[PDB]
Amino acid sequence: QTTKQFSKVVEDLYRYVNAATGKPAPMISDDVYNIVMENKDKLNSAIVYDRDFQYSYFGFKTLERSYLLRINGQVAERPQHLIMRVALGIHGRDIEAALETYNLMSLKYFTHASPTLFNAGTPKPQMSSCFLVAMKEDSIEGIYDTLKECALISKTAGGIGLHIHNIRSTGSYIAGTNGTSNGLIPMIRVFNNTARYVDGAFALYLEPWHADIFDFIDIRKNHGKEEIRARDLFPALWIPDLFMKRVEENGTWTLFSPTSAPGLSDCYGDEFEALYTRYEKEGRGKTIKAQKLWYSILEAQTETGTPFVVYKDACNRKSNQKNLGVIKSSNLCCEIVEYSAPDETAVCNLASVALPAFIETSEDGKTSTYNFKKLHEIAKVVTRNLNRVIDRNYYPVEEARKSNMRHRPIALGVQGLADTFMLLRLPFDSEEARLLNIQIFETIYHASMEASCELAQKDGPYETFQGSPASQGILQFDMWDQKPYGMWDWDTLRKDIMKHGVRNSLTMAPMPTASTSQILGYNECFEPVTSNMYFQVVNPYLLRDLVDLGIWDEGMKQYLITQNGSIQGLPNVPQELKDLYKTVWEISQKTIINMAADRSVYIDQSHSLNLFLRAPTMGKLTSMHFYGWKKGLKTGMYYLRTQ
Amino acid sequence: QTTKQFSKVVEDLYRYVNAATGKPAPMISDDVYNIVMENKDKLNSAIVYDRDFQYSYFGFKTLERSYLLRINGQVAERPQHLIMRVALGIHGRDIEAALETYNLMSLKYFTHASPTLFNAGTPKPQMSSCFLVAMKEDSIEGIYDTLKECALISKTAGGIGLHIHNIRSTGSYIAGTNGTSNGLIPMIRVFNNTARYVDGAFALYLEPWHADIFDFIDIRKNHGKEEIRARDLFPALWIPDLFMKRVEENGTWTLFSPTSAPGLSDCYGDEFEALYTRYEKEGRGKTIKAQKLWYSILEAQTETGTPFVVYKDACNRKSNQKNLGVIKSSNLCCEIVEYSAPDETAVCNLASVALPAFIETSEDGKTSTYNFKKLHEIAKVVTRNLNRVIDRNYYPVEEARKSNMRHRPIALGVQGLADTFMLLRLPFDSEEARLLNIQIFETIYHASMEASCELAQKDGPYETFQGSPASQGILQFDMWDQKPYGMWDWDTLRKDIMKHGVRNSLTMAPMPTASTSQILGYNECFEPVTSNMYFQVVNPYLLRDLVDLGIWDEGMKQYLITQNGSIQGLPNVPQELKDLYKTVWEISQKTIINMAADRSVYIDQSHSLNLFLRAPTMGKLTSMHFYGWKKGLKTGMYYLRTQ
Ligand SMILES: Nc1ncnc2c1ncn2[C@@H]1O[C@H](COP(=O)(O)OP(=O)(O)NP(=O)(O)O)[C@@H](O)[C@H]1O
Ligand SMILES: Nc1ncnc2c1ncn2[C@@H]1O[C@H](COP(=O)(O)OP(=O)(O)NP(=O)(O)O)[C@@H](O)[C@H]1O
Ligand SMILES: Nc1ccn([C@@H]2O[C@H](COP(=O)(O)OP(=O)(O)O)[C@@H](O)[C@H]2O)c(=O)n1
Ligand SMILES: Nc1ccn([C@@H]2O[C@H](COP(=O)(O)OP(=O)(O)O)[C@@H](O)[C@H]2O)c(=O)n1
Ligand SMILES: [Mg+2]
Ligand SMILES: [Mg+2]
Incomplete structure (x- = not known):
């Protein structure tokens, strides 16, 4: 159903002709085509096609229906081809960097946002979200x-x-x-x-x-x-x-x-x-x-x-862009907080880290631990990727080019926070989840600023860096008047940033991950599961547990369908499970807001905080708003979901 | 209810301040204000306020509701003030020309189109229609x-x-x-x-x-x-x-x-x-x-x-603009036929001659005649006015300025053709009406080209005149391959145009006259009356006749209401009256089209030919279209009205 050889697939996409009009319609840029042809043997042999099975049915169907390039209505690209097209689209002649990005994406360590997945490697590569x-x-x-x-x-x-x-x-x-x-x-x-x-x-x-x-x-x-x-x-x-x-x-x-x-x-x-x-x-x-x-x-x-x-x-x-002027808006999903003006349209390129990837059973005795050192290393990779996108992006309007080249903001985010807690047996509202949440966001922010500082030693800082908070040694948490959790060494980094600058005015903006999290098969982005049952698929972690305890029957399944994804008040299910698999409707929004506030000290921009209110009253909604507001949140609320 | 002195009224309009915001909001330009103050005694004493009674109730109400300038919701201008404001707005420092235009408009010889009446003499004088x-x-x-x-x-x-x-x-x-x-x-x-x-x-x-x-x-x-x-x-x-x-x-x-x-x-x-x-x-x-x-x-x-x-x-x-390129459209009312392109937006300034003004009983024995020599003289005046408007106009977009200054088109039209025939006792479909129609349009076209040629001897021809049909001695009727009726001397004019040029690429475009004909109290523009009864006002000419014959009673009035404005098949009304006061629904559209074709040989641009079909069939409508088309018409049809 699909050609195997990658360079063969590149050739078909590049040579493509719209039969109905007789117009040549290349789906690959001159640049990437010439790169692929000069490196075809290295490139073709790097792809591991086994890796197409790392996807679920609904993840594959997501890719198939919208992402994989089509020749005359027919899928021309394999998932591995899409990923290598993206890697070259980002990295160009840097075959080594391309190969590293291919391996990490294909193993599902991270992904880029949809427009990057659509347009990386193609003739008008508009990769910004x-x-x-x-x-x-x-x-x-x-x-x-x-x-x-x-x-x-x-x-x-x-x-x-x-x-x-x-x-x-x-x-x-x-x-x-x-x-x-x-x-x-x-x-x-x-x-x-x-x-x-x-x-x-x-x-x-x-x-x-x-x-x-x-x-x-x-x-x-x-x-x-x-x-x-x-x-x-x-x-x-x-x-x-x-x-x-x-x-x-x-x-x-x-x-x-x-x-x-x-x-x-x-x-x-x-x-x-x-x-x-x-x-x-x-x-x-x-x-x-x-x-x-x-x-x-x-x-x-x-x-x-x-x-x-x-x-x-x-x-x-609390914006590192405050030397530019007064910021007058956020974006479609309320994560981006950047300066705009009649002559400058702020833009941002997005990617998310897959949080569960860093769980390892590595240890003595079957306990899972979290590999923060590897999270730090992958976040550096993604930071370098997003910075390259800025330079290889096709800007639809001149106002966007002028803004991006001047301030170079980027936006790293996450998916699978819920899966991560679930795999580690930590209830979302626990003290251990609260701690892990802070540590994860501390390392991603540390990693991104470190990668960005290294880029500034290679290329100079971004144009408007002088006069910024970061130039004075003032990082995000300092603007919240908080000490960092201190799992990473901030003094040495701040020393380096003050001396060398950073390449990017902003680095973090946890986004909704609406489609990209579906491609990878994880929950979404820092949000709890909305139900344990999303043609009906039961939470894999919950399923595993109910089978292991020998309580999973048709009587179990119905009780899940019937209470729509909730396991509370299910008669014969251990309390440890109920605590672990609380739905978002079952978690206090004061907890949600607390965790948003905790992570926000390490977030440059903002984050798309959806709120979920079970039985909504004017009074409950008011106190949610005033609670977030007093917590110092930037985004008090994205969507309000109810029922 | 209104200050009498004109310069006093100008002063109020010019000094006007929006009370709600405290913004000065002059309703008179610097230019016209300075002109009026330097000439106040000549100006104030020229106005004849008797002339405000030359209007009907519905003509006055038309002026009052939309035309006369308002100070805080209250009418500040008298009709005579509006007319002198327009005259100065057109003519500027040329007090003499202004005075002549004041006298001719105030006596209802002619009027300018609504935007000229709205905006002449005001700070953003956008006078084009x-x-x-x-x-x-x-x-x-x-x-x-x-x-x-x-x-x-x-x-x-x-x-x-x-x-x-x-x-x-x-x-x-x-x-x-x-x-x-x-x-x-x-x-x-x-x-x-x-x-x-x-x-x-x-x-x-x-x-x-x-x-x-x-x-x-x-x-x-x-x-x-x-x-x-x-x-x-x-x-x-x-x-x-x-x-x-x-x-x-x-x-x-x-x-x-x-x-x-x-x-x-x-x-x-x-x-x-x-x-x-x-x-x-x-x-x-x-x-x-x-x-x-x-x-x-x-x-x-x-x-x-x-x-x-x-x-x-x-x-x-058949366009004098054919040296410019291919014409791709007409306008909102289908009278204007001018070249347009991405960098050139064609514009036109409009005015209409009041055809009944030129009827004089002058003679031996109570017969009315038509004064063609005076029609010719007033059309020259209007032509000179429209040319001045081009230079004093505020253009909303640069594309419009560039077009107008290059080609200088104008558009003269008419109102009260129906009244004219009615006053002369000529049925619309008669041989005498057919002749008068041709002679009227011959003189207006002759007059406008003569005025325009005189302007070209004063100022040079318009920029794109070289290469035009007119530069080769080819006037409108020649492009229809017809000899002119010959009431005016065309050879001498054509001689002069070939030698000296003309100032305007186009001069004639009979327009609907929807509001301006109401202000003056005449029928409309080359169209027959639509009814003899338009809170119920009976055709004044018909009324006069029915009273004179001693047949006008309540029994008459009802028969008019009841047959909605038709006098045909009214039992005791002389045939001469029925022939004279045929409604447009009662006249053959082949006659309408014949008269449109006759006048079109003297029309530079086009004209807004509405069609009226009593009992409409696909077959009747088809033959109307094909008849106009074969007649060589430019505008085959503007609106189709039925019932
Ligand atoms: N996203 C869109 N939605 C609706 N219509 C579109 C869109 N893009 C293009 N068009 C239409 O297609 C035509 C071409 O638009 P244009 O902005 O020139 O597209 P383009 O990307 O340059 N492709 P082409 O014109 O084929 O070289 C215009 O008539 C547009 O109205
Ligand atoms: N004809 C109109 N219809 C609707 N809105 C209008 C119109 N003209 C102006 N506006 C609105 O009023 C504002 C000013 O428009 P603008 O084009 O600057 O008008 P202007 O003629 O320059 N007058 P001002 O701005 O008061 O000096 C904008 O918010 C417009 O949307
Ligand atoms: N339906 C959508 C969703 C997102 N977006 C943009 O993409 C950004 C990230 O949203 P997301 O993380 O849900 O997008 P994906 O990359 O997962 O498709 C938003 O901040 C929006 O600017 C959009 O244009 N249309
Ligand atoms: N309702 C209207 C009528 C006319 N017009 C414009 O004015 C021109 C002449 O129409 P008209 O002779 O009925 O206008 P008045 O000057 O009598 O109001 C048309 O060719 C249109 O371009 C308009 O913008 N809106
Ligand atoms: Mg195009
Ligand atoms: Mg303005």
Whole structure:
């Protein structure tokens, strides 16, 4: 069904011709083709085809349906071919690095994000997952320039975070007409329609003092007038601390059109508060009860899972990019926290480490341990990969090229945190899981900064490194005013960074891993399992245990189907198992938030913290938000899932 | 209720401040303000306020509701003030010309189009009614650049004609993806949505060999899937002669994607036919029965009044702009026929002559005659006005400035043709009406070319005059291979044009006059009355006659209400009256088309020929189209009205 020889497969993909039009349509770049032909024997003999069976049925089907390159509707690539295409696409002439990446990916130590898997080694290799776009100007020309830019980015793969704080609100004056602005909603409908035309995937960012806020937060509601909804876009709130204070005090909140109150989004913290309370005192806006807004926000979150919540002041106070300017948005999945401006669209290239790969029974007596030294080594590899992607990437718009080449941010993440705890017999809410969580993120952050510092000794630091927190020896945990756990030597690293610089302004942004975790067969990313039963497949670790204890029968299976993936209150199942295989609906969200806060001291950017509320009340949701906020989180909430 | 002194009114408008924001919002330009202050006594004393009563109730209300400038929701301008503001807005420092235009407009000899009436004398004086826009390129970038340009033009006043022949059709290949084009309809929905956002008014032009044609023609249907309709846009067909021949032969017709059949819209006539039949023979497209398309077109016209029909080869063969390139569209109302390209958006400034103004009882014995010499003199005035507008206009986009300054087209038109015939006791379908129609259009065309030639002796000819038909002594009627009626001396004019040039590439484009004819109180533009009764106002001329004959009673009035504006088959009304006051539903469309064809030999551009079909059949509509087509018409049909 598929040619075996890799160079033979490369040849077919490269020579490919669209029969219907007679147009040659190479699916491999000149570059990678010439590389493969000059090295065919080394390359062909390196692939271990046994490794195609490291995938599950649903992992293979995921690859088959979307990832493996097709010739005339037929799969042309084997999984091993996809992986070697990616390796060369990243590494180019560096055959050695390519070979190392081939071996580590093929053994499932790590993977790159979907767009890298799609486009690495191909003629327009757009490998970035994330674009953060500034609304160019409060004008028809700026709106339409911004729209063109989103269209062109959406032509390729990857999401958009778009901030729109600078657009004048409903009823605002326009110079040259007697008519007024119709505000955000009509303009959002324009963007919605472009998202649909160019083959969703836009998040919109707004600060809650904007006067169109009440409609903005309701944009995904499945009822009401069809011309007030924008159903393919996601609203995200970019929330100042002052809003949270006014809500908690049960105080007032003032809504402005940005034309009546200029500059509010171009400052944060104390400067924001001073500027805000001054405009408030000067009668420039419309005052409400803060809790009236607060309540409408919880209503929309309860109904639609949105708006997302990202804390503006936490993002800005604790960003290594703070020498660039004020950060005005996150991205589609709320992990990326990078500077953007009309001339600079922040981009990011993504990869995730497979956490269970580092478990070894290695020891005396059948206990599993965690190999942190190997985690550290693989994270260095991935860091070097992501840095290469930056240089070999095709940028859809010039604003993205200019941003990426200047600041060189990258984003490492994880999958299989849940599997890891499960394999080590650690309940997600245990003291041992809490510790392992901190140690894992300490080592990945240590490793990435070390790799990046080595790159800066080879190539120079990134352009804007001088003046950064990192240039002053201030690493992420220091900006949380915490000492690191200290499994790695931070003083020596900080010494080296201050002397040599780093090659990347940012390194860590744990992402959802929605498709890539399915390819590898692990749970997802720092999140607990959502059920133990996802045509019905039972949690392999749970299955193993129930068989070993000799309790697994049809009576067991039904009790799992019927309680949808929960094993609690199953009569004859040991407590150790119930503790180990708690669903995310069964774990306290204060625990989830605690662990998010623990790991966040080692996270440069942010992370996509989904929240899961069993029996949701306004009161429970409020206390979750205020708890995350006071913990110092950047991303208070990504999606709210309920039921 | 209104200040009397004009300079006092100018002062208020100029000093105006938006109270709600504290922004100064002048409603008069620096230029006109400084002009008015330096000439206040001459200016104030020239206005004759008696003349505000030359308007009807519904004419005044038209002015009041939309035209007269407002200060804080209150009318600040008197009709005489609006007219003098317009006069200075056109003429500037030329106080004499201003005064002449004031007198002629205030006495209702002529008027300018709405945007001139809105914006003349104001800070952003966008006075043009018509923009013809080329789709920039078959790419996401070109589509979105075009969209931005339409948005910016629509911010101001005036319609868009947009040609889209160059966009690849549904299912076409895209290089760099496995997916295909979704064609025109999705892209049309993008434009529809922008039209709604920026405060309809777009016509779309397509040649009927495009493979998306069947959906394109159905875009205004009031049923079917909401995502195949574009309800605020108007489809217009840009029809090659070959299509009409294939339909009449009951032959085949081939549909192409422009990417499979390049160049089809960049040629016409014989070159088009040769290129087309070659692509047809080479299997590059999909063949159908021509009459299958023909039938779907009549169905859409019957249901929706659209698509408009404009004959591509007639427009190109008979255009003075033919040295520029191939013309690919008309405009929103199908009167403008001008060259457009990605870097040149054709524009046009419009004015209409009030035809009844030139009727004088002057004579021996109470007969009315028509003063052609005075018509000729007023048309020269209007021609000079329109040329000044070109230079004092604020262009919304650079593409429009570049086109207008190069070719300098203008568009004179008419209103009150119906009133004129009625006042002279000439039935619309009579031999005398047929003659007067030809003589009126002969004099307006003679007058405009004479004024324009005088301008070229003062300022030089327009930039692209060399190589034009007019430069070779070929005037419009010559391109119809007809001798002029000869009430004016054409040889001397043609001699002068060949020697001196003309200042304007085009001069005549009779337009709908939808609002301006209401302001003046006349019927419309070369069209018969649609009824004799339009809160119920009876045709003043008919009323006068029925009173004079002593037959006008409540029994008369009811018979008019009840037959909706028709006097035919009213028992006791003289035949002379029935002949004189035929409704447009009562006049043969072969007569309408004959008169359109007669006048067209003196029309540089085209004219907005609405058609009215009483009891419509596929057969009647077909023969109307083929009759106009064979007559050599450019605009075969604007709207189809029925019932
Ligand atoms: N015709 C329109 N329809 C809808 N919104 C408009 C329109 N014109 C302007 N706006 C909105 O008002 C804002 C200003 O648009 P812009 O193109 O800068 O107008 P302008 O003529 O320059 N007047 P101003 O910006 O007040 O000096 C943007 O947020 C637009 O979306
Ligand atoms: N992602 C998309 N969604 C919808 N239409 C598209 C998309 N990409 C291209 N098109 C359409 O296909 C045409 C070509 O678009 P363009 O941006 O030039 O694509 P391209 O990548 O340059 N490929 P090609 O034009 O075939 O060389 C235009 O008519 C577009 O509307
Ligand atoms: N449906 C999606 C999911 C993610 N993304 C982008 O990809 C990034 C990472 O999401 P992910 O980890 O779920 O993506 P995969 O690489 O696993 O497909 C996000 O931050 C988005 O910018 C997208 O464009 N569309
Ligand atoms: N509703 C309309 C009508 C006309 N127009 C433009 O104005 C031109 C002349 O139409 P018209 O003679 O009915 O306009 P008025 O000047 O009488 O308002 C058309 O060719 C269009 O380009 C428009 O933009 N919107
Ligand atoms: Mg502006
Ligand atoms: Mg292209």
